[PDB]
Amino acid sequence: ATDLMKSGDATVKGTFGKQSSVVKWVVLAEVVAGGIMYMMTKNVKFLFGFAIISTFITIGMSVAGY
Amino acid sequence: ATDLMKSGDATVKGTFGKQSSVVKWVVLAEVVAGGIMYMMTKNVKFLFGFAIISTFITIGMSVAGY
Amino acid sequence: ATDLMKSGDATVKGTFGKQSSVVKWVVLAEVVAGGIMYMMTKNVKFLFGFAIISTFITIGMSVAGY
Amino acid sequence: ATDLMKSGDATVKGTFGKQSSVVKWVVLAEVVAGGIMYMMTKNVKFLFGFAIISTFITIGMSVAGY
Amino acid sequence: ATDLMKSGDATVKGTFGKQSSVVKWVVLAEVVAGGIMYMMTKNVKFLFGFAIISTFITIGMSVAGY
Amino acid sequence: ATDLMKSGDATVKGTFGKQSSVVKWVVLAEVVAGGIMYMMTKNVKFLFGFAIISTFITIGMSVAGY
Amino acid sequence: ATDLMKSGDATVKGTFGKQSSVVKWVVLAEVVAGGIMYMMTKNVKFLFGFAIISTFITIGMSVAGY
Amino acid sequence: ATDLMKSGDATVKGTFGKQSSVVKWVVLAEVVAGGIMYMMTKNVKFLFGFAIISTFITIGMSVAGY
Amino acid sequence: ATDLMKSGDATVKGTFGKQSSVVKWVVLAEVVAGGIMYMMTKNVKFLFGFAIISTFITIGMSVAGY
Amino acid sequence: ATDLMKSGDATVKGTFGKQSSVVKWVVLAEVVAGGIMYMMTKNVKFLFGFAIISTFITIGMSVAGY
Amino acid sequence: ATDLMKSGDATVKGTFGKQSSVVKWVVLAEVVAGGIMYMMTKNVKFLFGFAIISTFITIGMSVAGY
Amino acid sequence: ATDLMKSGDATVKGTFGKQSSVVKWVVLAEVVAGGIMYMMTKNVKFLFGFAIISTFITIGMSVAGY
Amino acid sequence: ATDLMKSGDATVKGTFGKQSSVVKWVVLAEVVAGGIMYMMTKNVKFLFGFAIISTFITIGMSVAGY
Amino acid sequence: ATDLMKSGDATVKGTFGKQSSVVKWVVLAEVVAGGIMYMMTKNVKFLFGFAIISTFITIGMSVAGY
Amino acid sequence: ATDLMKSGDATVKGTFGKQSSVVKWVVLAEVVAGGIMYMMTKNVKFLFGFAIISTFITIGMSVAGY
Amino acid sequence: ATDLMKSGDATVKGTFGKQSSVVKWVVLAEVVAGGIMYMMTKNVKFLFGFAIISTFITIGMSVAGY
Amino acid sequence: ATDLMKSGDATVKGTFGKQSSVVKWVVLAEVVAGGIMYMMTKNVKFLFGFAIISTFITIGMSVAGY
Amino acid sequence: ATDLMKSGDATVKGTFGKQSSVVKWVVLAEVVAGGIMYMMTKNVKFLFGFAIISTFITIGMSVAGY
Amino acid sequence: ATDLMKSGDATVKGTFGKQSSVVKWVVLAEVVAGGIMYMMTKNVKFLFGFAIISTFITIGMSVAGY
Numbered sequence A, B, C, D, E, F, G, H, I, J, K, L, M, N, O, P, Q, R, S: 001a002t003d004l005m006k007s008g009d010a011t012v013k014g015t016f017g018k019q020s021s022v023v024k025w026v027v028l029a030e031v032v033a034g035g036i037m038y039m040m041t042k043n044v045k046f047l048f049g050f051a052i053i054s055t056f057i058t059i060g061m062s063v064a065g066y
Ligand SMILES: CCCCCCCCCCCCCCCC(=O)OC[C@H](COP(=O)(O)OC[C@@H](O)CO)OC(=O)CCCCCCCCCCCCCCC
Pocket: A036, A040, A041, B022, B025, B026, B028, B029, B030, B032, B033, B034, B036, B037, C005, C008, C012, C016, R043, R044, R045, R048, R052, R055, R056, R059, R060, S042, S044, S047, S048, S050, S051
């Protein structure tokens, strides 16, 4: 291959792909955010956000390939 | 593994997962919020919010994996 | 433990759990609210609210664990 | 040919064209960015950005020829 | 399955379906409400409400599937 | 196809279409809402809402195609 | 033609025109939004919004040409 | 003519005039924006924006001469 | 046809037209209401209401076309 | 014509004019509403409402031109 | 004339004047709104609104000159 | 005169004075805005706004001298 | 005079003073409102409102000076 | 005097003091507002507002000194 | 004295102290603001603001020494 | 004393304490309000409000110390 | 002591502690607010607010230590 | 020790730790803020904020170690 | 070893690692910042920031090795 930077996928996928700790933390953050904002406001949009983010990331990562 | 940040789960799960003190505090806050807002308004939605949040967090955390 | 915030339960439970002064004050507020609103309107719902709040908080706090 | 620098396309295309690791990383970054910014703000524009970037790069690279 | 949120039925059905404690409590509330409002007003509609709610929930839950 | 985002239907339909857990939960919520609001107010509109929502979603989803 | 960017219509129409997955998802979102907001508020405007959006997009896309 | 840059109109008009792919894409973007923002907020201004932009561009381009 | 919502008649007529279970239930409710209110008051208007409602619905549905 | 939005009448008339499914559904709703509210209250105004709405829509649509 | 923007009246009048499709749609919307809100509430103000809007627009457009 | 910019009044008055197409368009916009917002809300302030704007502009332009 | 806005009285008095078309329309509206609300409710207050408004405006305008 | 801005009172008092056209217009607006809101709602507070504003401005301006 | 800027009090006090034209204008502005906002909203807070500002400035200036 | 704002009591007590013109005006307003609302509704609560407000202010001001 | 800012308590306590003029003014404001809002609305909550604020401040200041 | 900056704790703890004048002032500020905002709005959240801040700081400082 | 700068870790770790006075001061700063910003705005994000920073630093320092 001529892609001089090709080897970087091992750690980029490791750290930033769907299964990485960083991605999992972002999803976790929504569960917590949903809980506290709903508690505070009772606005149902805060609960739907969880399903939305999980769906978004799932599609995004599939398309990105990571 | 190639996930350079993998070790962070020990404290992220500790502090922000289902069993953490932060999550428990958010649930507690609803019990109190339910009580005072119902006292103030007598609007039953304030009481249902407790069951809703507990259910939401339970599902969310299971899905998040924490 | 890995829960970096674990120590906070001593005062959170103290101040916001079932036996705290804050919770007791909310219950007291209903007794007073019940009395004055019933006096004003004679609508029996104002009297039932006391039993409802006491029951709600009792269940909520048990579930929350505080 | 008289293009003294012609041979450079092998690595430029390898590293910076549509299929390179660099380009893939930029797309991945949007998936992550979308996720975290939506989590933070709930502003839907953050989710649309993914489809926009993928579309943009696809067109751009086709036109550029890489 | 592709329903990313599928696992949530275990607790949603548990807590909010026909046999849950929440639903049973709502029905109980009508028995009490019927009793006190009839006592107060002698308007027979308060007694019929019990049969109506029980019938409604039975049909609703069957249709909802919970 | 030229629709760069086409693959997303597998999970969007799974999670948000007519048969998904999210949609079923919204319908369930009406059964419960109908029950409690009718109990509270005896206003028949709360009972009709169930048939209305079920009908609405059925038509909407058919038209949306999910 | 002199439109240097002309080729972009293949994917723009694919991803953002009337028949694309993105557009279909927006319509689906209204069915769900209609359902939950009507459930919550019983305000009929939430149901009419579905017919309105479908009509709007149909006209808009025809005029846009996508 | 003495306008040293005169020849540029062939591609400027091609790419940036009324009939170009760029202009069409901007109009399309409003149809989509209108749809999603109305879905989110139900604020009618989002629907009127389509007619406004189409009208604006039509006048603007006529005056500009492209 | 240009009526984007045309397909909805299959279930609207099914659920809300003259022969639907909802309509039949409303008529049944009058038989019961007539019986109990006449029992309570001996006011003949309660008995005539049955013939009136049946007649009303019959005409109304014919005119509505369902 | 200079009305840039002229083509929209095909679907607006289809979906929202006198003969559309939406309009027919609104009329049907009155037949049902009349029936149930009269059953509940015996207030004759509920029966007259049907003739009133049919008359209103007939005049309104004629004037609107749809 | 010195009004650099004068030519815009051809489409502004076409799209936004009294006879345009946009204006007709707004009037139609009242017929529908009147019908459904009267059905829901039986408040006569909803019926008068039609005559009011038609009168308002007629005067307004005459004064505006479109 | 010493006003180096004096000649600009020919087009400023043409385009931005009382009789210009821009000013007429702003007034037209109120007729439309009044109509749609009144339709939506039935708040009479939306109708008075037309007379207010016409009056305001008339006074303003007289004072400005354009 | 130093009142920079003094000239505005010609049209303010014309349009909004006692003899203006706007004021006359408000009075007319009461005659109609009185008629329809009395027809609907037979509550005499609706008839007295006419004399009250006429008296109010007469005094108000005299005091205002318009 | 050392008040560098002292001369401004000639026009400030002219335009914004008790006797100015601006102040008179605000008072007039209440007469009209009172009339229309009372017509609409029959809530007597709308009539008292006139006496209140006149009294308020009279006191305010005396104190302000304009 | 060693205060190199001491002489500035003659005009600062003149222009910005309690008795200056600037301060008087700010107070006047409240009388007008109170009047128009109360006219618009009937919210009594707009009337109290006058007494509040006068009191505030009086105390503030005394403390400032100007 | 170290209370930098201490001097403000002279005017705060003057304007807002028990004997001030503002407080007297609020009490007067109740006499008038009582009169007109009783005239309108014959609901005795409007008359008791006078004794209640006078009593409230008397106690409040004593406690406040003004 | 090592608290470099320690001396600030003399004036902070003076101006912002329980006995300061600022705190007394806030309490006074409630007496007035209670009076006027009760006069306006007859909602008893406005009267209870006085006892609530006095109690709150008393506890708060004790805990704060000022 | 190798911490070249170690000596700074004497004044950092003095000025910014739990017992410092700065921290005490922040807590005091909430008592005052609670009082005035509750007075203004009657929104109970303003009162709870005191207990929340005291609890937060107590936990935070313990964890920080100051 | 060939790392000519190796000895620097004694003071770098001392001053800038997890246990240093500098790091502790940054954490302390958040406790204070959280307190004051929450006091000012009541936005819960200010309280969560403490747990977030503590968690971040803990992970970061572990990974850095200091
Ligand atoms: C430090 C303690 C944290 C747990 C406290 C929970 C016990 C008390 C909570 C409820 C009392 C509030 C009044 C009830 C309900 C109420 O009326 O107030 C809710 C109110 C927000 O209401 P909004 O302004 O959205 O409401 C608008 C309308 O609803 C007006 O009524 O104030 C809050 O934000 C309370 C939440 C504070 C944050 C609570 C959760 C804290 C989560 C983070 C835990 C800390 C992690 C970091 C630790 C260092």
